[PDB]
Symmetry: C3
Subunit: 149 residues, 3 copies
Amino acid sequence: MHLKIVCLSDEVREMYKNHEGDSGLDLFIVKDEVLKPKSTTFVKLGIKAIALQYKSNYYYKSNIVNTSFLLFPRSSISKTPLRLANSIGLIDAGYRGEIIAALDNTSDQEYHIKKNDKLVQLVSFTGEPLSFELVEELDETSRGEGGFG
Amino acid sequence: MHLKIVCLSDEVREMYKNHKGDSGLDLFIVKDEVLKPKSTTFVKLGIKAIALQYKSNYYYKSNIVNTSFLLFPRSSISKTPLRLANSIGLIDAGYRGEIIAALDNTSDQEYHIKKNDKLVQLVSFTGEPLSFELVEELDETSRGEGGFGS
Amino acid sequence: MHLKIVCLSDEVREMYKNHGDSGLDLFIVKDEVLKPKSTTFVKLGIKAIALQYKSNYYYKSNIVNTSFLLFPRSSISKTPLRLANSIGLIDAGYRGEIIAALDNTSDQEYHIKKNDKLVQLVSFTGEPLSFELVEEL
Ligand SMILES: Cn1ccnc1C(NC[C@H]1O[C@@H](n2ccc(=O)[nH]c2=O)C[C@@H]1O)c1ccccc1
Ligand SMILES: Cn1ccnc1[C@@H](NC[C@H]1O[C@@H](n2ccc(=O)[nH]c2=O)C[C@@H]1O)c1ccccc1
Ligand SMILES: Cn1ccnc1[C@H](NC[C@H]1O[C@@H](n2ccc(=O)[nH]c2=O)C[C@@H]1O)c1ccccc1
């Protein structure tokens, strides 16, 4: 699966210019942030992303198409008090919004995520190796980050 | 992937006639229910379902088959204190029971769910788009809601 | 999909020798006390690879190793244990022991017993699973 990732700030772009014939693509925490104790915080991952797979035959009742994909916790999240609220995120084929990780802080202390933490990863519904590239837009629409003005 | 869904009551049938390219199919909470604080409740979704996909050759040591499939939380469950106790439910190809969501109320107060809330969704193992239709039975067994009599 | 499982001990091998569906259950292999309000890395005492047919995938001889998944069993929900990382992703390249990160959410300790089945191995496609017990991967 191949992902096109639009970084929403330059600080993020520099993180991903760094960065793997692997199943998951790790995502960065892009900004130091405090998570209140006993809370769910919607943590903005500062990127938009489209995933491409070869067209496939599926039952329902241009070799390369958009596809839905998954936001998984990284196994090393287990070591912390944070847990993904929604278990596993399902990003649909369309999707053009900022990817959000919803993290439950299960402790009663506040928790500091730091820039460059990796808590979550994108994963293909097929488990296949992921490749990505930075692009400036996903498509022509404003939500795509493309088009005029 | 195509879901044949059997609604277990008339009330549920109407909710599914009225239903709003997509990878998950939202399921309704079908009955106002109070969930106790700090507990796990097995919330009956009032439906049974099977999933149909193209037959595949798979390594294991008409072209439409029954397939196993996935029960995911909707991401809007995040706003609530309700968490899905088994993370992602696996429903096997053969399963003819009512679909249950096991919801942990992590809050220390009672949580009230309403008829028409949508907290969970069915999703295909391959993430392809889903269609569904409402049917009177899944198969000929009683558990499947079908066959002769009562 | 098909799994090659190396049992890490004499005693574990037994449990799998005396064990086609969508997930393969894994045993709790030794009695253990889980502390209250805690996360424990519970060792399952197996190594495993998974084999599926090669596929064309977009990216920029019959068989290959694929990634597979570690799901909780639906029955885990009767316990106060939760899988910390929701669903475990075991990569194609992984040769180490399989661990289940379990959160004990109880304010009391919780004892797991050998022959408990709390988690299960599932394939990316939901296809029926099979395994054999080898000596090495
Ligand atoms: C938080 N928030 C504020 C406005 N919209 C939202 C959300 N919308 C879900 C979309 O986000 C995408 N989405 C889905 C799952 C996920 O884990 N991360 C996502 O970005 C595809 C889903 O379609 C939202 C996002 C994450 C957790 C909860 C809720
Ligand atoms: C709690 N309870 C009381 C009577 N039945 C149940 C349970 N049903 C397990 C089966 O239901 C199906 N099942 C599996 C996972 C799931 O998330 N939802 C389900 O309906 C397939 C599984 O085969 C049960 C249900 C949900 C979670 C845990 C346990
Ligand atoms: C516990 N521990 C000590 C040294 N390394 C670890 C761990 N490392 C992750 C590897 O284990 C494999 N792994 C991944 C996810 C999972 O649920 N179970 C696993 O066994 C493949 C992953 O690559 C570890 C294991 C489990 C949860 C968190 C962390």
